Amino acid sequence: GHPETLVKVKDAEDQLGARVGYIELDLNSGKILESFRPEERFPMMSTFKVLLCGAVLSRVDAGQEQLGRRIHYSQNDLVEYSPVTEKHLTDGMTVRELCSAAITMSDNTAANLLLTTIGGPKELTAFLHNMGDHVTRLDRWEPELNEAIPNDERDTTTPAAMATTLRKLLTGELLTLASRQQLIDWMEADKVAGPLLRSALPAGWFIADKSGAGERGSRGIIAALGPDGKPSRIVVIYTTGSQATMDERNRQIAEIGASLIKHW
């Protein structure tokens, strides 16, 4: 081990006045390289949308779902922050287009439509349970799942549960090679995480990620990244409770990123 990245995480808790959870693990082996508050609960916020598309792709592999299936919805279905879904009220969107919106843009209505396809949030929790994650739970829809009430276990994960689940989705036995490639392709094309780990990422490095933001200062990111255009580690960072500006929360996550890249 080495101290420098955990010192940045402690610095982040000092300057945000809030808990930060962190885990760095080896993508192939699953070996934890370093951690901080690994068994504490944090609100998932939009980071759940990757797990949601993992559940959709499992159903695609089984033939219970088709990526080209077209879904139509109405004005009444649109919730706050629906940048893609708000443009397709007349033509609808394919399951594939919905997962692209939920992951690349964090589209909230797209995540609700996908949750409907699997029977809702408790059915996402049953999928996670069945793949060996007995900690992570989704309970509510967009936008209520972002409430981040202190001590409320609803819509929460731990850094260690989320990192091990993301490893199993991206590189584990659960999904076909085609479904693994699609999930990381969506994450690679994330457009709403620019000021987080991507701000620290050197030129030729790979990153596939998913950001989140909720109430009470809740902010986080899940990522597969590494040098030479190939992912080799998973990083999960969560914080909740901070009264700091979004820009300070973003800078703290990017500073933890700069540290873990420097000490790779």
Side-chain angles (χ1 to χ4, degrees), residues 76-95:
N76 252 246
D77 297 308
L78 293 172
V79 295
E80 62 136 288
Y81 189 68
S82 294
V84 181
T85 54
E86 83 188 340
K87 294 156 66 165
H88 301 269
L89 282 175
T90 72
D91 56 319
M93 287 171 69
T94 65
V95 175

Side-chain angles (χ1 to χ4, degrees), residues 163-182:
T164 54
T165 293
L166 183 62
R167 177 164 164 287
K168 276 149 134 95
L169 286 183
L170 293 185
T171 63
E173 293 194 16
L174 181 66
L175 295 175
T176 64
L177 291 196
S179 283
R180 292 160 50 185
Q181 191 62 66
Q182 177 60 265

Side-chain angles (χ1 to χ4, degrees), residues 80-239:
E80 62 136 288
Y81 189 68
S82 294
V84 181
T85 54
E86 83 188 340
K87 294 156 66 165
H88 301 269
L89 282 175
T90 72
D91 56 319
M93 287 171 69
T94 65
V95 175
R96 187 185 276 108
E97 281 167 345
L98 284 164
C99 269
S100 187
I103 294 174
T104 75
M105 286 295 288
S106 221
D107 189 299
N108 278 330
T109 295
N112 287 348
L113 291 162
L114 293 169
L115 276 172
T116 303
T117 73
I118 72 158
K122 299 292 214 286
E123 301 304 339
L124 185 58
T125 304
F127 164 86
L128 294 175
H129 186 87
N130 295 328
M131 54 172 291
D133 180 350
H134 295 190
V135 173
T136 304
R137 55 185 286 173
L138 198 76
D139 294 278
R140 283 173 299 178
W141 303 82
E142 294 287 6
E144 292 80 12
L145 65 88
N146 298 299
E147 204 172 5
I149 303 299
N151 290 127
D152 188 355
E153 290 197 322
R154 281 187 301 184
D155 307 307
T156 59
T157 190
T158 68
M162 172 59 61
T164 54
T165 293
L166 183 62
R167 177 164 164 287
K168 276 149 134 95
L169 286 183
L170 293 185
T171 63
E173 293 194 16
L174 181 66
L175 295 175
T176 64
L177 291 196
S179 283
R180 292 160 50 185
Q181 191 62 66
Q182 177 60 265
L183 191 54
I184 205 159
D185 282 350
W186 280 326
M187 289 182 70
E188 184 178 18
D190 187 2
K191 288 175 176 174
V192 296
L196 297 178
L197 295 179
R198 288 153 178 281
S199 74
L201 195 76
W205 283 46
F206 176 97
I207 189 166
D209 61 14
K210 184 69 201 80
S211 63
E215 323 231 85
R216 310 185 76 119
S218 63
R219 193 72 169 127
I221 195 168
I222 71 179
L225 83 168
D228 305 350
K230 292 199 175 88
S232 61
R233 306 184 185 174
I234 284 167
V235 168
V236 173
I237 302 159
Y238 290 115
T239 179

Side-chain angles (χ1 to χ4, degrees), residues 3-16 18-23 34-37 237-238 252 255-256 259:
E4 295 87 355
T5 308
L6 297 176
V7 167
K8 249 53 152 97
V9 171
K10 291 161 140 180
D11 287 350
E13 292 201 336
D14 186 1
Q15 296 188 331
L16 294 178
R19 297 176 310 121
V20 180
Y22 169 56
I23 193 142
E34 55 188 21
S35 57
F36 193 86
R37 305 198 182 270
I237 302 159
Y238 290 115
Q252 287 305 325
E255 285 232 60
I256 298 162
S259 184

